Amino acid sequence: ATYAQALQSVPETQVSQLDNGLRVASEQSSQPTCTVGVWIDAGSRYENEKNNGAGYFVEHLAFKGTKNRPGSALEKEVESMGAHLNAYSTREHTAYYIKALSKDLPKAVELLADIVQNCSLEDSQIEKERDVILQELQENDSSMRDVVFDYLHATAFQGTPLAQSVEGPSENVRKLSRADLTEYVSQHYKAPRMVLAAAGGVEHRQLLDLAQKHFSSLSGTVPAFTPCRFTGSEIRHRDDALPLAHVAIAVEGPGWANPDNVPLQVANAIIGHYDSTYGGGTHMSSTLASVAATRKLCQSFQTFNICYAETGLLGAHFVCDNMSIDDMMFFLQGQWMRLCTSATESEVVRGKNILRNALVSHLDGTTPVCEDIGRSLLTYGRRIPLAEWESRIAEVDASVVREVCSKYFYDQCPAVAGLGPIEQLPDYNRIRSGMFWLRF
């Protein structure tokens, strides 16, 4: 077992396509469990301002009931068989995965065929879920991380569907009507933009037969998004009652395929993540982590690489007190420019190992593997094997990182989103000036 042999000895993600365009995929390896999901290609990205938040509403209403399974009967099927049903809908993707035992894979598929195709959209249920949406949005107001990320998306992709939040404006939540939800489920849940992915012990032939016996009667064989724009700006929500000030800084990243993703993920891996409850503290190779632990100017910071199809956000988000935001911005920008101008080999090797471990450790359990399958079939158009990932990491070197960071970080107008006691946060001019180094 020489690692590379293990990557070569990974079961292949077998993929087939029905006449309707359903991309069926499976990764049968050993387990008696499975995760079966249908990864839609819908989300808030494909929503007009009137329809903003319809995807969230459809996600909520999906599990309530169907015509074949009125209301709680659906739940009765999921719990009585031991299955765990779950859904998640981001800006550009939506999925309903039902974790279950591999023995009862047939029924689950049928169950899934009910949820995505034949929904209920009951009007009384619509009002009951409208109220829940409102209170849940008031809940998410408390989530500082989510609020700051939505602020970043609003200020970066302003005037574009990317700015639209997943939940939608509170006004829309009240103004959505059953006609809009029916249109959305009849316009963004079409068969071509579907990925039926199953992990665990799921034989591919059985999956194909089940899909052809349950998902056959679907749409036959246009809204295809608009290339959004990046607008260097900032949203500063100065609110001096929150104890900490969450700040998120990002630059236009790569596209979904955009092989430059592999070097950048290494570069961000060099920065790493730090918070107050970590271990080593003033010993991590990450200069930001070491400095933060030496001065306690950071409460929790991480590097994010939210990457959409035509563009993406690459940056860092940090949480700290009111008197340490400027020191943060200084050190964060300084490390960014240090990688930009002189990246050297050793930290590149560390980033390569870090990225290898991230990709390898993420792909365990039926749910993460199935999520990888469904997302890969939509974004990259193929399930990128871990061997290919290793090959793409291998040739990344110091020069490659120094050039990709130069092409993405050096002298680029950023997007900033601060919330809380963010008065100490430097104005946009100083932040923009941080992205160029007179010493260079």
Partner: protein
């Protein structure tokens, strides 16, 4: 008196934009000129009268000095 503890403010939202994306001279003449005229009209009433009083006393003083340094009573 440094950034961080000047005062307390809440529920304020400030949007801005990178200087490299928005125009440096937005409507410099389309909106600049009417604004200049409005600002001029706002303060001309309270600025001019003291100076026109100066101009009046100046012209009167110079002409009276010229008149005094002359020949009449002899």
């Amino acid at each position: 008196r440094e950034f961080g503890h000047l005062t307390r403010m809440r529920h304020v939202i400030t949007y801005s934009l990178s200087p490299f994306e928005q125009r440096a001279f937005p409507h410099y003449f389309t909106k600049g000129i009417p604004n200049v005229l409005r600002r001029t009209r706002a303060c001309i009433l309270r600025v001019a009268p003291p100076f026109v009083v100066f101009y009046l006393v100046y012209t009167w003083g110079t002409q009276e000095f010229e008149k005094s340094k002359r020949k009449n009573p002899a």
